[PDB]
Design an enzyme around this catalytic site. Structure first.
Site, PDB file in Angstrom:
ATOM      1  N   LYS A   1       2.927  11.618  -3.773  1.00 30.33           N
ATOM      2  CA  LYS A   1       1.498  11.076  -4.161  1.00 30.33           C
ATOM      3  C   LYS A   1       0.508  12.140  -4.559  1.00 30.33           C
ATOM      4  CE  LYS A   1      -1.848   7.285  -3.489  1.00 30.33           C
ATOM      5  NZ  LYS A   1      -2.290   6.409  -2.125  1.00 30.33           N
TER       6      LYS A   1
ATOM      7  N   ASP B   1     -13.285   5.283   2.116  1.00 31.99           N
ATOM      8  CA  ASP B   1     -11.691   5.190   2.132  1.00 31.99           C
ATOM      9  C   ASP B   1     -11.083   6.727   2.014  1.00 31.99           C
ATOM     10  OD1 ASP B   1      -9.181   4.764   1.891  1.00 31.99           O
ATOM     11  OD2 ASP B   1      -9.281   3.420   0.002  1.00 31.99           O
TER      12      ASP B   1
ATOM     13  N   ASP C   1       0.838  -1.322  -0.194  1.00 33.34           N
ATOM     14  CA  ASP C   1      -0.037  -0.017   0.088  1.00 33.34           C
ATOM     15  C   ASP C   1       0.944   1.262   0.029  1.00 33.34           C
ATOM     16  OD1 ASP C   1      -1.889   1.761   0.220  1.00 33.34           O
ATOM     17  OD2 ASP C   1      -2.478   1.670   2.347  1.00 33.34           O
TER      18      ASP C   1
ATOM     19  N   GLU D   1      -7.374   0.849  -3.991  1.00 35.87           N
ATOM     20  CA  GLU D   1      -7.266   0.950  -2.530  1.00 35.87           C
ATOM     21  C   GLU D   1      -8.804   0.178  -1.940  1.00 35.87           C
ATOM     22  OE1 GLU D   1      -5.785   4.784  -1.483  1.00 35.87           O
ATOM     23  OE2 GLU D   1      -4.011   4.321  -2.534  1.00 35.87           O
TER      24      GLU D   1
END
Ligand SMILES: Nc1ncnc2c1ncn2[C@@H]1O[C@H](COP(=O)(O)OP(=O)(O)O)[C@@H](O)[C@H]1O
Length: 518
Positions: A68, A196, A6, A173
């Protein structure tokens, strides 16, 4: 042995499926998650993870995090330009992309693609697994937000390649979280809603799960909404309060702004179990101290528009799936920001008092699912049954006359998928035909996101309208587009050029060599 990683905005996590269970692998400091941080010391050392995060406040300009939030984006993306204010490292334009510039010691500057920073984080996660397993790891399943666009997906795959990983599969994800939740459940068909909310991105996915068969029916998200935004709202509140009270503007002092970050993150976490939190910084600015009490009420108030905006994707998913609130059988919360009491409250109230599924660590469940997926794809037989149907997040279309979005492949289509269309020329002997492909749900292309401009080249000379070129648009299982062309004329090689400027094998090789210097 294939691992699941992850790769998160603020933290990353690595798991392996072995001897019939998932192990979340602890790093060399004993931590089951690792900060997604890279730093360069004055002496020329490179630090990754906990050690990098620990010296943020003493070496802010050369401490890199939140890559990211930049990866796969263009320079003029408003999400990039809005975030520059809160990042201590210089962000410079290069290849129409936001590159990161740092001092590596001896005066010397170095510029990095966001992909290269994420490759360094992936390398640390790989090394964490290699230490635990006692052997080389060359293959991995790597996570991305569900709502990541084509460029963001490809850039994450490239980070994998730079880190010496053959990326077996990119996994969404919320899909990973669903696998963690649902593997070995034999209840028949259930409708599962995964909410999420991590450090940088927000996704909602609705899945059916039925005895090992997982299908995403609908997904919607916001790739620039997460815990880092909640921090930055509080940071900006105090930067403005300080200027109002003292006259002094601290936005260019990087040590001041990043000490404020450190304290705000601490306070935020405390406010998930307490109702007040003390912010204290010694030598905040020009030798002066800073003390402020932040209540839960004030934290909630400063972020309430962002918290309430998490219900927008929830309703979009319910609309696309044609389901009512009462059809949702389980709510799965993942991402660390789902610990915020107000977020839990807003989700619970939206679903008329329904409690979330128990037994899920929101920091680890995504990596857990990625590790399961890696094991299944490797050929493991001690894993639970897993058949996965996942989807493209965005409608792909082509720009037509009047700036119109002509739909080609709808959002929420199961991948891999393809569509073909015949193109011709507008003028006699025309050698090149240009096609502009967009990503989004709005009727005009100026309100959607440009994926790329593709040129059909080498069209042989003929009168206008005579050439018949079949162009195929294929989205692969990773969610990445490939465009190809075949001449369907009666009795030529048609090559396609594009303006995406992907990292070439040559460029990747150079980046691998440059990373070996540390
Ligand atoms: N108890 C908590 N209260 C509020 N926010 C939290 C808490 N724990 C973690 N977070 C936030 O969750 C995010 C971490 O999410 P996580 O899923 O662990 O990694 P990533 O952010 O990379 O997805 C950070 O923004 C962090 O501040």
């Amino acid at each position: 042995t294939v691992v699941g990683i992850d790769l998160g905005t603020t933290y990353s996590c690595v798991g392996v499926f072995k001897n019939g269970r998932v192990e979340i692998i602890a790093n060399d400091q004993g931590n089951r998650i690792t900060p997604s941080y890279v730093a360069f010391t004055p002496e020329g050392e490179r630090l990754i993870g906990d050690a990098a995060k620990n010296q943020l406040t003493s070496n802010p300009e050369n401490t890199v995090f939140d890559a990211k939030r930049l990866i796969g984006r263009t320079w003029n993306d408003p999400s990039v330009q809005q975030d520059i204010k809160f990042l201590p490292f210089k962000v410079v334009e290069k290849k129409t992309k936001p590159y990161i510039q740092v001092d590596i010691g001896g005066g010397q500057t170095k510029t990095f693609a966001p992909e290269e920073i994420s490759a360094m984080v992936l390398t640390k996660m790989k090394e964490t697994a290699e230490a635990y397993l006692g052997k080389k790891v060359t293959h991995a399943v790597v996570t991305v937000p569900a709502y990541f666009n084509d460029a963001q997906r490809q850039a994450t795959k490239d980070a994998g390649t730079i880190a010496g990983l053959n990326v077996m599969r990119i996994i969404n994800e919320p899909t990973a979280a669903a696998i963690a939740y649902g593997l070995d459940k034999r209840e028949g068909e259930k409708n599962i809603l995964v909410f999420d909310l991590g450090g940088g991105a927000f996704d909602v996915s609705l899945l059916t799960i039925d005895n090992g068969v997982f299908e995403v029916v609908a997904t919607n998200g916001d790739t620039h909404l997460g815990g880092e935004d909640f921090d930055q709202r509080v940071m900006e509140h105090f930067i403005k309060l300080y200027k109002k009270k003292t006259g002094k503007d601290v936005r260019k002092d990087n040590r001041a702004v990043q000490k404020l970050r450190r304290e705000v993150e601490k306070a935020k976490r405390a406010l998930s179990s307490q109702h007040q939190a003390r912010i204290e910084i010694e030598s905040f600015f020009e030798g002066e101290d800073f003390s402020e009490t932040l209540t839960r009420a004030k934290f909630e108030e400063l972020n309430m528009d962002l918290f309430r905006s998490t219900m927008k994707p929830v309703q979009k998913v319910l609309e696309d799936s044609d389901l009512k609130k009462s059809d949702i059988d389980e709510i799965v919360l993942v991402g660390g920001s789902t610990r915020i009491p107000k977020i839990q409250q807003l989700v619970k109230e939206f679903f008329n008092g329904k409690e979330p599924s128990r037994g899920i660590n929101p920091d680890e469940a995504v990596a857990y699912g990625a590790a399961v997926q890696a094991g299944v794809l490797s050929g493991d037989q001690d894993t639970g049954d897993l058949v996965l149907l996942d989807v493209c997040p965005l409608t792909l279309g082509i720009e037509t006359v009047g700036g119109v979005m002509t739909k080609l492949i709808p959002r929420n289509t199961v991948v891999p998928t393809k569509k073909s269309q015949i193109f011709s020329t507008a003028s006699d002997n025309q050698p090149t035909v240009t096609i502009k492909v967009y990503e989004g749900e709005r009727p005009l292309t100026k309100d959607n996101h440009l994926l790329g401009t593709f040129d059909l080249t080498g069209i042989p000379p003929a009168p206008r309208g005579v050439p018949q070129i079949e162009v195929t648009f294929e989205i692969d299982v990773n969610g990445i587009l490939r465009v190809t062309a075949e001449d369907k004329g009666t009795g030529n090689k048609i090559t396609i050029t594009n303006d995406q400027n992907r990292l070439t094998p040559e460029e990747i090789e150079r980046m691998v060599n440059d990373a070996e210097k540390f």
